[PDB]
A paper describes a structure:
Leucine aminopeptidase (LAP) is found in all kingdoms of life and catalyzes the metal-dependent hydrolysis of the N-terminal amino acid residue of peptide or amino acyl substrates. We report here the X-ray structures of three kinetoplastid acidic LAPs (LAP-As from Trypanosoma brucei, Trypanosoma cruzi, and Leishmania major) which were solved in the metal-free and unliganded forms, as well as in a number of ligand complexes, providing insight into ligand binding, metal ion requirements, and oligomeric state. LAPs of the M17 family of aminopeptidases are bilobal proteins with a highly conserved C-terminal domain harboring the aminopeptidase activity. They form homohexamers of approximately 330 kDa with the active sites facing a central cavity separated from the bulk solvent but accessible through solvent channels.
LmLAP-A crystallized under many different conditions, forming hexagonal plate-like crystals, one of which, grown in the presence of actinonin, diffracted to 2.5 Å and was in space group P321. The secondary structure elements and their positions in LmLAP-A are nearly identical to those in TbLAP-A, with the exceptions of β1, β3, and β4, which are shortened, and α2, which is replaced by a loop. For both the TbLAP-A and LmLAP-A complexes, the electron density was sufficient to model the ligand, albeit with less than 100% occupancy. Actinonin in LmLAP-A and TbLAP-A is coordinated by the Mn2+ ions and hydrogen bonds. In LmLAP-A, the side chains of K299, D304, K311, and D389 form hydrogen bonds with O-2 and O-4, and the main-chain oxygen of L420 and the main-chain nitrogen of G422 form hydrogen bonds with N-1 and O-13, respectively. The N-14 atom of actinonin coordinates a water molecule. Superposition of the active sites including the actinonin molecules reveals the high similarity of the conformations actinonin adopts, with the only difference being in the hydroxymethyl-pyrrolidine moiety, which forms a hydrogen bond in TbLAP-A but not in LmLAP-A, where it is bent away from the corresponding residue (A424).
Author numbering:
A (entry chain A), B (entry chain A), C (entry chain A): 3 to 539
């Protein structure tokens, strides 16, 4: 295993990567759900979170940790605030920590109506006092239809599994010391009751939780450990677990087979570039079932190339493989759901995920500001800034997915931590969606509201983008000739040009540079956006 | 006149400003329209511009400059290109210059379907060879419904009236040497035929042309000439011409009457701050007629304050009164249309325009990064960056318009060259619209497509904006505590907070920092957006 | 009052400054102390804070809010952490909020052994839930000798009195909604028992609390309100209250009487420069009693002059009058203590405080990088950077205090928010002390450890500083000719050169640029350092 791997020159380093792989390939979330109608014990710690109306309801006096101190906490909580206390509750002996959090009063049209953001903030703050081996009970007052946003909001708010604090290096950088037990007021996960005529079950919410958290792990892991060879070995194990076809083009194979864009970007790095694609044909696909290809930026580290980033922009480029992991782990959850019941993604015939893997490293073998590169699609590109490497590798990615597979997709989802312009456009919680079909734009926005992985449209206007990418000696450049030329859209437009001409349906580009991480680290963004988006028709 | 004015200490300077005022108060466009069915002569220069289909039609052999060289030019023009020639045409003796331009093949959903951008590029390039006193005939092949976009596209593409080249200073910086004669293939302006059941007539298109070009003049004029006292004198003359009510709050009157935000911003400048508001009650208002208030950033020069801008960001801050002029000149055109026929803006009862006038100047009396200012609305503001001055003055503007007039608006339109984040968001041709009502957002986008003054939504999410404006000692700051916090929306949100609580309908903020100008200078952006937006219901 | 003042041209602005003055001239802290042996009621909110040993002692079961939930909180608190709960306690009806905070386990030689920093962090976090008109009880487990550090640590951690949130502008920017009641385990304040043979009484701790908080108010107030004329009017009222001599040199009087350094710095500003000095002869001075002059940088706003600071370095220059306020409010407390008992500062004959008041403003009348200025001391200075304005004004300050008063000081204390080099040197909690006498250095360090206003020596080496201030055409420059030339010491050395030759005892320069403020704003730093320093012999 450690000897199979073509990675480092070192037994010790290789032995520890073999363990890191395991923690990734057998990963399980540390979230459980319990049917509110079957609560018989109460955890060492309890969080209660909901709309102020719902918290003050008499329906809550049933919950098994109700008692006078808790009742008092409910008199004192105001919209947006928190009240915390110890209490002697039945359902436990001794004292129990109860934290009570009201969600905010007002929500706007562009935000998730269940307020999954506040749920995450409230969860995170309750986990801080949970001791090794204990459980945090999370009591959520959210209406039926909110299950996936809750599963996401909680999963992503748990203490992160990647750490090296206090010796964890010796245990594969993996810590899952505590545990979250979700108790929703709605029972739809347990009854399979239909909401907007769709059902989502408990085994699915676990698959989401596992996938969101695997996503936080891969993102959070530094590139000294999660490089392109390791990331690829992981993808292989998930391939053999799920029983799916896998296509890998690696290193010189990229250049030999004409993927000049991604080979150029990753040619300098210690460990080489890969296009890795996993795909499943659904055996229970219905007559109407569409085909879906997904593509993600797997830049394991972005140093900037020769357009080397400064120190303060370069940290966190750990996370520049976020788009990649979002769609990779969404693939896993979707396929897992497909294997659970005949009907679950019945309207999907083929699903494909393409990982565009590479480190953008700086050195003699670096692609230069001025190099001219011939992408797989045939289009020639004049590299003006080597730090716009995402565009390029993704260009070869989307061409592979649209023009080299044995089925033609009917929709292409591009996901990438692409640009800082994104943050200026749409802030740090909403991804930027650059979409060639108004209906697919609306639908992605909506899957964002339902999922709690928010989204917002950015300018789609190829005629205007075309005219800031003009090169004197190639088909296009890879950065615009002007400042303040709608920077996130320009990133999408670049990638759009490399779609095989045989592909005729929507191209949906999700730029999630800022939403992919926050103070605590990786958010898992993307995993639940895609699950929703694909689940809804 | 020159002695009435409380401006400079100088007879000469004051004599020349009196002339500059005149050129502004009697301004007329230099655009005419001629009914295509009544063309009897052909101009020294001719431009033909349209969709390639429409150009190659046999319908064109009728135009009075048809001849073999022209026919040949039509064989050679390809989509997007230009062909130019001299020809002996009947309708003139001697040779005539004919330029033939095909509009582009493909347009996207976010752009004007008539391609008013290409029309403007094509016009501009034909005007360059027109000699003093001559006429350029502009033959446009555009379908009925495109009249306002054409009037705009052409008006704004003429050589600019503000110049000091070759002695023009002695003629009030005003040059209108040539003239454009528009000949559209559609006759709807001349027949009053209904399109989508609305009619627009020739006297209206002239009012638009005049207003777009007055807008380019005011914007283009430097602040050594167009300062707040002069800009105010102009607004007064237009008030007395159109017979409307005018309210001016000036200098110490602002501070005495509680407009701390705008008084703070402009207190350092040579010439003082003004809130200037013009308003008309429509005598022919129908039963349903709504009320409309408009507000614009009139920062005549933005030096940055003490957060002084560098040299290269500071040039063109001439144009930082663009939002102001767009809505001011839209007011003029709208009111002019109202005075033309009983029915023309029948669904509008009251219209108001508020100019937020001030120079952001640097000096001892400057408002500081740390000053705390009490806006008219009562909300206290902690100034962290004095270069976000637009927010502030506009804050007092919208409060005046929503809370101090003798009618309550049902819609507030805020227009401002507000932020560079705008350019990063939505490029240099599309304004950023920050809108509190999804229907009003869609409607503004649409008035942009019909008008050729383009637009694109930006994130509306006050819950997320609220949390980056937190101050420890005031209600809010005036810049966000984070980079990449959706910068254009944050600008709108700041202004939104100062709306009087009595105002209950949509707030539509248009951030047009980049679309307000291009290489040649001021575009007139805003004038035709607002005309369309208000004309459609 | 509002008409006496030579300030603004405005009745409204002047009426509100008259009220701001009042809030400053009648200021009282909102801290009280209660003898632990006489606690009969318990407040709505309670904080318990101490060393873990002391918290777990059985001595605590007596406190009137002891009960089982509280007992449980004490089992759970670990060194450095916090535990919070509601409880039914006797001493109150209903529920009471109890927060329990353990101070940190380990302290180093350069920090206050009572850990006044953690006390402040713990207080601040308990005040956040206290409602209008309520009381927070603060139970501190600290040994006798810690009274002044506690009075300081708590006073400075209260919610700040300067605010404009929610209409406070209409109530003079003054909010004191809640109240803190300190209950120390030691009774030395109440018994007058001697510690290291010195006693400190309750009326003194109140005078400290009042002075620390007046200091936070003056600092926190922006310069649009707290300018040099207002700051001077305040100093006058405190002069007439305390019955002390006052000398003011203002505006042209500075230049006429030879104070070129400070007149130069402040000549550009809206409101003019002042040297303001307050001084008391102690009627109960003992035979040995020394004389003490104090001097502080009162730069009410530092824009940088023509060496204009960028936006992000310029905010918080509100606080550039911190050194000034520290020593001003220390003067008040000391004098107040003197008036309380015959013996209290018996070893002090004369005390003097000199405020070096000015705004460093940018404009035509600005002192330039290249101007040569003749300080009061006769020494000529070549201004190379106008943003090193503190040095200069303080130079005239120390000369006044050492050479123009009717007594000669035996020690000069210079206090100033002088340099950013300070932060690089000694961090954000320790001031930099540049001291001409090793014994006075040690003593100031020690008054810092006892007071909780920390301190740390910086390089004293005039022979090395002399050689980086060489000018070709003046006695010295005002900034060093080299980067990384011990920047905080160089600031002190500049000021040292302007001491009158008649002054022969120690010069102690305290550079407190970073310790003067934190996230929440002004810390009051300086007030309690000086009280301690002077109290100890
Ligand atoms: C033109 C540079 C390439 C655009 C894409 C990069 C983001 C990136 O590195 N993707 O791989 C970017 O936006 N970088 C930001 C950026 O805009 N930069 C980089 C240096 C200055 C400024 C120039 O646009 C930083 C500051 C977050
Ligand atoms: C935070 C500054 C205030 C935001 C608004 C200004 C635009 C403005 O001056 N309006 O009056 C801006 O975006 N300025 C741009 C900008 O973003 N700046 C200014 C200096 C660096 C950078 C900081 O955001 C420039 C470069 C076009
Ligand atoms: C040489 C400048 C004058 C030294 C004193 C100033 C602090 C000050 O302004 N006092 O009134 C300083 O240290 N400023 C800092 C500083 O060191 N600067 C200012 C700009 C760059 C750098 C140069 O030393 C800033 C960044 C906190
Ligand atoms: Mn990247
Ligand atoms: Mn990059
Ligand atoms: Mn501006
Ligand atoms: Mn500005
Ligand atoms: Mn200073
Ligand atoms: Mn300075």
């Amino acid at each position: 295993s450690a000897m199979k791997r073509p990675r480092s020159n070192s037994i010790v380093e290789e032995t520890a990567v073999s363990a890191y792989v395991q923690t990734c390939t057998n990963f399980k979330s540390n979230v459980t759900f319990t049917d509110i109608s079957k609560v018989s014990c109460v955890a060492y710690h309890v969080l209660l979170v909901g709309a102020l109306e719902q918290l003050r309801d008499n329906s809550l006096k049933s919950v098994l940790f109700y008692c006078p101190a808790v009742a008092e906490a409910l008199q004192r909580v105001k919209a947006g605030s928190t009240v915390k206390t110890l209490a002697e509750v039945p359902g436990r002996k001794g004292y129990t920590e109860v934290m009570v959090t009201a969600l905010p009063a007002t929500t706007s049209r562009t935000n998730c109506p269940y307020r999954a953001d506040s749920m995450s903030e409230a969860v995170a703050a309750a986990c801080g006092s949970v001791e090794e081996g204990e459980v945090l009970d999370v009591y959520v007052c959210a209406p039926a239809g909110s299950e996936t946003a809750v599963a996401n909001a909680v999963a992503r708010a748990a203490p992160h599994s990647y750490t090296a604090k206090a010796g964890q290096a010796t245990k594969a950088y993996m810590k899952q010391a505590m545990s979250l037990n979700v108790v929703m007021s709605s029972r739809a996960a347990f009854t399979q009751e239909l909401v907007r005529g769709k059902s989502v079950c408990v085994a699915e919410l676990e698959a989401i939780c596992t996938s969101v958290q695997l996503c936080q792990r891969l993102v959070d892991t530094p590139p000294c450990m999660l490089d392109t060879v390791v990331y690829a070995e992981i993808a292989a194990a998930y391939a053999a677990e799920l029983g799916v076809d896998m296509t890998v083009i690696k290193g010189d194979e990229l250049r030999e087979k004409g993927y000049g864009g991604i080979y150029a970007v990753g040619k300098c790095a210690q460990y080489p570039a890969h296009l890795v694609t996993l795909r499943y044909r659904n055996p229970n696909a219905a007559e109407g079932a569409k085909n879906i290809a997904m593509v993600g930026k797997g830049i394991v580290y972005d140093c900037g190339g020769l357009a080397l980033k400064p120190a303060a922009h370069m940290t966190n480029m750990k996370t520049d493989m976020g788009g990649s992991a979002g769609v990779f782990c969404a693939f896993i959850a979707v396929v897992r759901s497909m294997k659970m019941q005949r009907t679950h993604f019945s309207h999907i015939a083929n699903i494909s995920v393409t990982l565009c893997l590479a480190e953008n490293a700086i050195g003699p073998h670096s692609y230069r500001n001025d190099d001219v590169v011939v992408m797989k699609s045939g289009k020639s590109v004049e590299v003006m800034n080597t730090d716009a490497e995402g565009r390029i590798v993704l260009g070869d990615g989307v061409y592979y997915a649209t023009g080299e597979q044995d089925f033609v997709p009917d929709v292409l989802i591009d996901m990438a931590t692409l640009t800082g312009a994104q943050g200026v456009a749409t802030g740090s919680k909403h991804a930027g969606v650059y979409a060639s079909d108004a209906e697919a734009e609306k639908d992605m926005i909506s899957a964002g509201l339902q999922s709690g992985d928010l989204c917002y449209p950015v300018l789609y206007c190829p005629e205007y983008h075309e005219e800031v990418y003009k090169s004197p000696c190639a088909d296009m450049r890879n950065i615009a000739n002007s400042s303040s030329s709608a920077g996130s859209s320009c990133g999408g437009y670049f990638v759009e040009q490399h779609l095989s001409e045989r592909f005729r349906g929507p191209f949906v580009h999700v730029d999630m540079a800022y939403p992919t991480s926050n103070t605590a680290g990786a958010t898992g963004y993307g995993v639940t956006l895609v699950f929703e988006f694909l689940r809804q028709h």
